């Protein structure tokens, strides 16, 4: 149970906060769990998704499909993956969006900021 009176358990206010969040908040809202190997190597359970991240789909119809994150569509809380698409009537392949919580990160797109973030969350690089 929550005890702080600074956090609201109102469904009206929690839904309003999630569906009216700015893009800075939406960055943390779309986080994905790291794979077991990365979990024990980076000492981090989950990370926000970023472009060029190598992920595996865990749930849904596209379960098992691997690929890089081609674009993080924050306005819809969706991830776009390479070659994970759907055929249209005219033959053009329409990309399929997968929720960030339904994928697992198997390889991180490490940069200077991500390494500092890793050691910030108690993580050995």
């Amino acid at each position: 149970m929550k005890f702080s009176r600074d956090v609201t358990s109102s469904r009206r206010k929690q839904r309003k906060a999630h569906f009216g969040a700015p893009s800075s908040v939406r960055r943390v809202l779309m986080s994905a769990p790291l794979s077991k190997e990365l979990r024990e190597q980076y000492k981090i359970r989950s990370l926000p998704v970023r472009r060029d991240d190598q992920i595996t789909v865990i749930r849904g119809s596209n379960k098992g499909r691997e690929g890089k994150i081609t674009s993080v569509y924050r306005k819809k809380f969706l991830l776009l993956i390479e070659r994970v698409t759907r055929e249209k009537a005219n033959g053009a392949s329409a990309p399929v969006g997968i929720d960030a919580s339904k994928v697992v990160i198997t390889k991180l797109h490490l940069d200077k900021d991500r390494k500092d973030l890793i050691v910030r969350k108690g993580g050995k690089v």
Binding site: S4, R5, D6, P22
Partner: protein, 161 residues
């Protein structure tokens, strides 16, 4: 509902949220350091005062007190003297020991005479003796400031120390 509140709802600008809502929270103690060290941040102010051996009120209490466990002639008032009172707890002993040790340290209440005060009283003593202060004050030439006998006596006393 109000047009001002509708205006800020329709805006794309975030609200000026402030998070100050935490009841059951009791004010932290500043002021006395001994009290702060021995204070219990959970217990109420009555429970803390009683534990520290202090009085939260020198008067009656206007309700029932909490019971947690089942407990098992004008001459002789204006002239009597009460020899303080025992310190029940250790916290009160620290307060009492600190008070007396500071009073002893800041106890120099004797003022030494200055250059002018020394010369002023010296001229009066070397002419009108030592034990007669009334004649010293009644002098007009040497006692130009017209100090009375009490002030000249104090100038003498401060000169000695």
């Amino acid at each position: 509902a109000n047009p001002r509140q509708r205006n800020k709802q329709r805006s794309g600008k975030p609200r000026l949220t402030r998070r100050n809502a935490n009841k059951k929270a009791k004010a932290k103690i500043y002021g006395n350091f001994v009290i702060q060290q021995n204070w219990d941040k959970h217990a109420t102010l009555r429970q803390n005062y009683a534990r520290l051996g202090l009085l939260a009120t020198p008067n009656y209490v206007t309700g029932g007190v909490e019971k947690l466990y089942p407990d098992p002639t004008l001459d002789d008032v204006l002239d009597k003297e009460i020899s303080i009172a025992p310190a029940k707890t250790e916290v009160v002993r620290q307060l009492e020991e600190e008070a007396v040790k500071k009073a002893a340290r800041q106890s120099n209440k004797m003022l030494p005479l200055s250059a002018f005060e020394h010369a002023y009283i010296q001229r009066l003593i070397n002419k009108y003796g030592t034990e007669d202060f009334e004649s010293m004050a009644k002098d007009v030439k040497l006692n130009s400031k017209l100090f009375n006998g009490s002030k000249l006596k104090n100038l003498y006393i401060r000169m000695k120390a």
